[PDB]
Amino acid sequence: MTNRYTTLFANLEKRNEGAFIPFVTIGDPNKALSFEIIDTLVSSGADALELGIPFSDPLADGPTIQEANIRALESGITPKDCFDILTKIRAKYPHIPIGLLLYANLVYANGIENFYQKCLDAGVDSILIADVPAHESKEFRDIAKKVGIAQIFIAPPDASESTLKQISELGSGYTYLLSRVGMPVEDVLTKLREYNAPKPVLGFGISKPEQVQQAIKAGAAGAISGSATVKIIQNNISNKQKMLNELTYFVKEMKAATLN
Amino acid sequence: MTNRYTTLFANLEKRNEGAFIPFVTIGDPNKALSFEIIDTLVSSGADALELGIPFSDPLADGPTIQEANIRALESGITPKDCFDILTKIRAKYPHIPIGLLLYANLVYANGIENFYQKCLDAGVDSILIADVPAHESKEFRDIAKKVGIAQIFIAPPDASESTLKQISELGSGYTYLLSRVGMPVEDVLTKLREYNAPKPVLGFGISKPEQVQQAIKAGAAGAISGSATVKIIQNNISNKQKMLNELTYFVKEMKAATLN
Amino acid sequence: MSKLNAYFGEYGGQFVPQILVPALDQLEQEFIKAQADESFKQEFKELLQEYAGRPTALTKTRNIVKNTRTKLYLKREDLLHGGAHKTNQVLGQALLAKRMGKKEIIAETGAGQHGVATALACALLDLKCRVYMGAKDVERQSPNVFRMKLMGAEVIPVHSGSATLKDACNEALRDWSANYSKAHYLLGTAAGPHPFPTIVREFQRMIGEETKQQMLAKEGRLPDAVIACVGGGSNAIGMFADFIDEKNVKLIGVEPAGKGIETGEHGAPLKHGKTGIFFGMKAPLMQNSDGQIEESYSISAGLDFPSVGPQHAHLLAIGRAKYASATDDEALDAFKLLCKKEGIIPALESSHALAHALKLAYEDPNKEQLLVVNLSGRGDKDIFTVHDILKEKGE
Amino acid sequence: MSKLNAYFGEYGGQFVPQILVPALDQLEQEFIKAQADESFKQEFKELLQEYAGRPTALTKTRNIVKNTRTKLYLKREDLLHGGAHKTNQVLGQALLAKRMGKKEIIAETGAGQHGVATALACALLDLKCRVYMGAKDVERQSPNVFRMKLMGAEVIPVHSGSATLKDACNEALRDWSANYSKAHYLLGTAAGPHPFPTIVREFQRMIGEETKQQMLAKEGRLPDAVIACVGGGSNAIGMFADFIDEKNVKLIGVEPAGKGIETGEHGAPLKHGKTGIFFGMKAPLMQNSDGQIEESYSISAGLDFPSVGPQHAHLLAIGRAKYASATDDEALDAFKLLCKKEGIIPALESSHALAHALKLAYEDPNKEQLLVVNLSGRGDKDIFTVHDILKEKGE
Ligand SMILES: [Ca+2]
Ligand SMILES: [Ca+2]
Ligand SMILES: [Ca+2]
Ligand SMILES: [Ca+2]
């Protein structure tokens, strides 16, 4: 295959840089401000986007992300409202990799393919379903290959070599790694490299620019910041102008840590 | 035998009158006022006295008498304090029948005979132990015949003819009857007359002069008022002068109902 | 035969007013006929088993005395329906009153445990239940009054006198004096006038009867001792009765020491009381030099009773049973231990027996011992009490 | 064999994040070895019998359906240690975690019932017990928090998000994600990811297993139906499991209708819910048109759960079991009836099953019927709730 991610990772290693992918949940804190948040994320130098769609019971996320699904739902955000934002973003920024972090019931209710079609029409490139493990992705992955969306899988550092091999083969776009920086991280990438997994990205606990620099080192194609980007939204809810500035500053300093 | 009661009941039927015997608990509401209460009872025309000694747990008495054992104990009344009052009364009023209404533990603790001796030294003529039935009086009655105090027994209207016969033979002084005025009362006295019981007295629920008059009628040697006399003490605790006047008036109007 | 012995070596008797004697004689005769009627005995067993939950477990503690060589067993009367042993003899008396032809039942209670047990029995056996209660106790026991009312019982607050348990006994007894032809009085413990001490023993017998047969099948021998708390005597005579003729089994009863025997605020007349006459019986009494009965105290309401059953006082004067004391703090620490080491919340009454057993284990930790504690009841009722005493100190 | 079916006709599964899969696989393998180890099976039985109180009674009601020809029986899980059926599967899982070599146990609770049951098991089996709890639930449940602390458990209030039961599951699960090598997660009901629905069924099986053998020895035939309330599915699958292969025994589960199904404030997704994926399983869900899970409601906290176990949803789609509803008022009136007619205070959860049985009796009063109600728990915990709803109306 060849998606927007393959174009990005080849352009990046050509320039010999790592990928910084911020995570922000769509509709947080409300629909109008959410688009401006996503807008400033791209303008401030994000290579790819990792956008969550608000769920009622995010049993896999920590408190910071939990408070952010709540903010969006309390304001009335709908999957429809999310596709409106995803559509308006890709209309402005073509060929910018956009992935979605979803919970399964948003996909299963109202039809798996029916939901997958709305994603591709909105310009989405990849989908990571948090509560669907690799050994139970068959129904979701088949539809993913028919519509043309890459299915992303999490590679936790304590799975079977059998399960870790299975994630390498089922994956596409990139591989989400729960390994920390500060089984060790290198020995995880070694198994993923031997099994031809998609390019690895680190996600868990990436908050400071230090952690990003020590993530492209030790051999990772990029790094995702979940809580660190959402927390800037949480701490500036009343102050729209300061929020976006603290946000643009965050993306620039985190992107600078992906060079060389 | 021939006690102060035999002298009284013969003098009364000679004058063809019934006996009015007020009940007051000794030491109620305090030691000094208690003697004046007992004093005014005799001066106002009482034929005999029925005096209780304060007990902690009077499980056989009603609320009015209960509140009166409490008043005396709260003021510090002792069996010693009671004998002082009994002694001072008989010193003033010789040959006036005085009975005691006691609970067994006051007798059993510190010796049965030892307690019975203090009673006779105080001038007491009879003792009714509320919580000692006829079939279990042997230890108490033997000592009663040795010291010379009459043992009084209650004749409830629903005991066996065997038990009712037993009370007639063990009794002395008079017989306390729980029969009401308003098995019937007459049929009770019939069994007591055939068994040569001591002269019968009615006690339960004798409050108004009406009930006294309808008690000497239907064949009873006398009548005891328990709650009615104690209640006058209860309703005038703060007013010493009104209490004694309402008390002397009560005894006179209750005694008038024993004539003819 | 139309008579049963009313005494235990000059302890006990029938020291009631004359008006109550025909009530006691009638109740005695019906009880004798009941123990001969086999349809009564089978209905009592089906009631205890299929409804009350008998037989109750005999648990072996795992951790509370692990540091010793003592094998400590618990007779699980907390698993009985109602959460206490009282249910046993309450079902018996109510069934007994049902075949006297009576539909009404008079009862009194302080904490509410006996009242709740009387209410649930009268609800199952379709009996009109009147429970007397001190007006102050009604105020302090809102959950237990609501339990009693939920099961169709008439709660009659008593405001006269002290307006507490001593005044509810007076109302319940005088009520029974006037109404014994239609109503029965369900006495709460193994004390009072004959035949109540004998009846309650026979309706709590299956406690000791089950332990003996359970202990034979579990460990193989008879236990070295059985330990039970002694308030009025109900649950302790339940355990002792079937062990009295086993000469090599010690019988240990534990009375409450309260704030300390030296402080006077206790409830242990069996070893610190003069014999007297009270509650229609001749028995040890907490009394002053004049004969007035003194106020008793315990941290658990079930043991706050200034006298004791007659058969216990007898068993002490014969040398058959030893009786010990446990303070508030010893029962409290035994309470907290059974929650933490085992998984059981005991009644603060039962914790007095447990605290004594913990003594026998920790004082000779290398001694091979097999002990039984009669866990007379659940501790959920004492949750509020333990929490406030712990917070008043440091918790 | 190293695998067990995770589905019940496309219901159930293991829809957890990848980080939790090795925890589930490990727990599955240990459970299979445990069911083959006979020293485990005997220790579980000695635990249920000599400690938890099994077998529990099977009571025949005397008055509540006397006006009909229905013979109504109650499986007395209220007489179990802890006052509810939860103790059964909590003792099993804790014993299972003890032989995985683990000393720690993670748990979550809302009302506190599961928390108390986990605490007493970990106290007896010497396990370090951490229970998560919503900060709002901690405030509303002072007696149950003090019970848990008395038995050595660490109560961890969760202040993030809604600060209630939904947030304690998040903490407990993420805790288990990081710490499954040393700690086990004691799931509270027969729902969630495989193998939890299968494990809980096997540790509540003895409910139905005892009833079948008790009913054969008591009445002689198998009952016409067994009725049990359905919150998550724990106590209902406990009763149904051994009756599934008895083709002529109806299986009736009763979900809460709350203030009325037409009002939306209910907890009955089995017959009013769209199938979805939640809590690591595929099962009926109270959800909106977009996929957000909706808030459920019941007067009893034990039934306030917007999903249901997988085997129940399967049993409905095969026609093997019927599932009904009972409103707040129907369970309340069934609560008040069992107190007055029988002598039992039922759990408001159990009263939903009872209210339905009272329907089957009163609707065809001349029909010869033999019904079983799984009395899943005691009602002492609901005393305060029933009193306030009665006073808010007219009592
Ligand atoms: Ca006291
Ligand atoms: Ca020593
Ligand atoms: Ca809810
Ligand atoms: Ca009909």
Residue numbers in the entry:
A (entry chain A), B (entry chain A): 1 to 182, 192 to 269
C (entry chain B), D (entry chain B): 1 to 395
The authors write:
Tryptophan synthase (TrpAB) is a pyridoxal 5′-phosphate (PLP)-dependent enzyme that participates in the final two steps of tryptophan synthesis in plants, fungi and bacteria. In bacteria, TrpA and TrpB are encoded by usually adjacent trpA and trpB genes that belong to the highly regulated tryptophan-biosynthesis operon. The TrpA subunit converts indole-3-glycerol phosphate (IGP) into glyceraldehyde 3-phosphate (G3P) and indole (IND).
Similarly, in TrpB (amino-acid residues 4–407) the N-terminal SNA sequence and the C-terminal end (residues 403–407) are not present in the respective chains B and D. The other ortholog, FtTrpAB, crystallized in space group C2221 and the asymmetric unit contains only one αβ module. The level of pairwise sequence identity between the TrpBs from these organisms ranges from 51% to 59%, with the exception of the FtTrpB/StTrpB pair, which show 81% conserved residues. The enzyme from F. tularensis, which is the most closely related to StTrpAB, shows even better agreement, with an r.m.s.d. of 0.8 Å for corresponding StTrpA Cα atoms. The structures of the FtTrpAB and SpTrpAB αββα heterotetramers provide a new set of high-quality models and enable comparison of the intermolecular tunnel connecting the TrpA and TrpB catalytic pockets. The MVC is indirectly connected to the βH6 element of the COMM domain and to TrpA via either a histidine (βHis285Sp and βHis294Mt) or a phenylalanine (βPhe279Ft, βPhe280St), switching between hydrophobic Phe–Phe contacts (FtTrpB and StTrpB) and the well defined His–Tyr hydrogen bond seen in MtTrpB and most likely to be present in the activated form of SpTrpB. While no monovalent cations have been modeled in the current structures, by analogy to the data collected from the MtTrpAB and StTrpAB systems the MVC must be created by βTyr311Sp, βGly313Sp, βAla273Sp, βGly237Sp and βThr275Sp in SpTrpAB and βPhe305Ft, βSer307Ft, βGly267Ft, βGly231Ft in FtTrpAB, with βPro269Ft replacing the threonine residue.
